[PDB]
Amino acid sequence: SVLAAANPIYGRYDDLKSPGDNIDFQTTILSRFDMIFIVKDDHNEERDISIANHVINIHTGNANAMQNQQEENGSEISIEKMKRYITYCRLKCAPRLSPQAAEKLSSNFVTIRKQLLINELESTERSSIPITIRQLEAIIRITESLAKLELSPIAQERHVDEAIRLFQASTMDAASQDPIGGTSLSEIRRFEQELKRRLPIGWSTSYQTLRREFVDTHRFSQLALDKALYALEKHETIQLRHQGQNIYRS
């Protein structure tokens, strides 16, 4: 098995720049990999406070006691026992799938393929991270490993859900991570002008009415929904409440 740690160009990921010119790897090499994790750095000062706490604790004056308690309460096990357990599990068991899991995997694969196509036809360049049959094999092997962990001679929905969750995390963090990379913008400024004039601060309107009006006009549904959700993403004038029915202008 291959485990690789790599840095992007320009050091930091630089989300402002497109993903296509942030990763220098070709399409062939990434396809062989099947879990790619984009580890971004963030500043919110609460995770920072916690991390500073953990580091100063893990300083050798303190952690040498605390970790010992993890071997006294039975919360964590020693390294060599884990080594023996993994070799025993590798030698002993080799699970198998079930037809319901096969159907669920098929439907999930069709869904992610459709989503990739819908992103590509919008961005009109090839995706820098591909989705192919090797990824289906990847999810199958992840499920197999999950079942192998508990020595169960069969894999069921409990492991399939976890495998799909991990795959969705590792694909939404990287592939569908802002696929647009930031009619052009002319309709955007026209759109923002009218709702500001027509809709004052404090009230709300139905989504269906807005969609009807701006599909009747030249804006149409494809442009309005993205514009509406980015005005939401601006997160300074418009808020959503009560499911997707209420458009609240804070």
Binding site: G61, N62, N64, A65
Partner: protein, 302 residues
Amino acid sequence: DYYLFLLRHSSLYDSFYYSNYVNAKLSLWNENGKKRLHKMFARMGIPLSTAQETWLYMDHSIKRELGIIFDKNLDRYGLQDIIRDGFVRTLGYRGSISASEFVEALTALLEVGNSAQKLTNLRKRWVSNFWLSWDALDDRKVELLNRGIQLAQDLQRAIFNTGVAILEKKLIKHLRIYRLCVLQDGPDLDLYRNPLTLLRLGNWLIECCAESEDKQLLPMVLASIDENTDTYLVAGLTPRYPRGLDTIHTKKPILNNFSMAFQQITAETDAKVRIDNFESSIIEIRREDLSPFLEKLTLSGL
């Protein structure tokens, strides 16, 4: 036999290094102590690589000659009070053991093994450890004695590591009547919730204090902290004469008035203490209540 920490189960170098009497006599917590120890080893003639081997595999000829070597060398450093006569028990081909080693193993096994709710849990694990030590007595079990020996080694190492830090930081405050020291912060504080471990630490400290040029015999008060309960565990310790002293100045052993002082202060003021130990010289006190209490103990007749 000699006043040596696990002589027949640890290397001779570590035995001298951890022995409390040699520590007190030669101040091994700083560099000059180690230099004098190395000088002693060289003048004896044992190599530093040889002296760091297990007692079983260490050389037979010098094992035989150890008595004469000690007799001829220890006089210059004045450690001849380390040699005594003891008891050894041998069972067939199993090996050899001595009373001091066996009791140290038992003590360590008692120490380590395996608000109100936590206190009850501690007091019940103490009983569990006592029963484990009891079961360790019989001759059909030795895996409950090897573990005790290795745990004794570990506990003595931890006690030495904390004592060197105490004497380095000079936390021992010399009041007018009694010395005082408090372990506010440091490493491995969770171990010292045990009264016997605290007494072991205090015994080493009082030995070190006695083995100095000071000519004042003052009672010592030692305190700890467990952040889970936010309470201070306090034990009073009496002074001790140097071991190599004549019997004429041994008319009466030094008494302990700390229990009486504690009970009197608790009777005259409403402190938040809990005096329930069978040893009446050990009490539990509150963090906010410690300092005024101490003041009272200072101002009271001892």
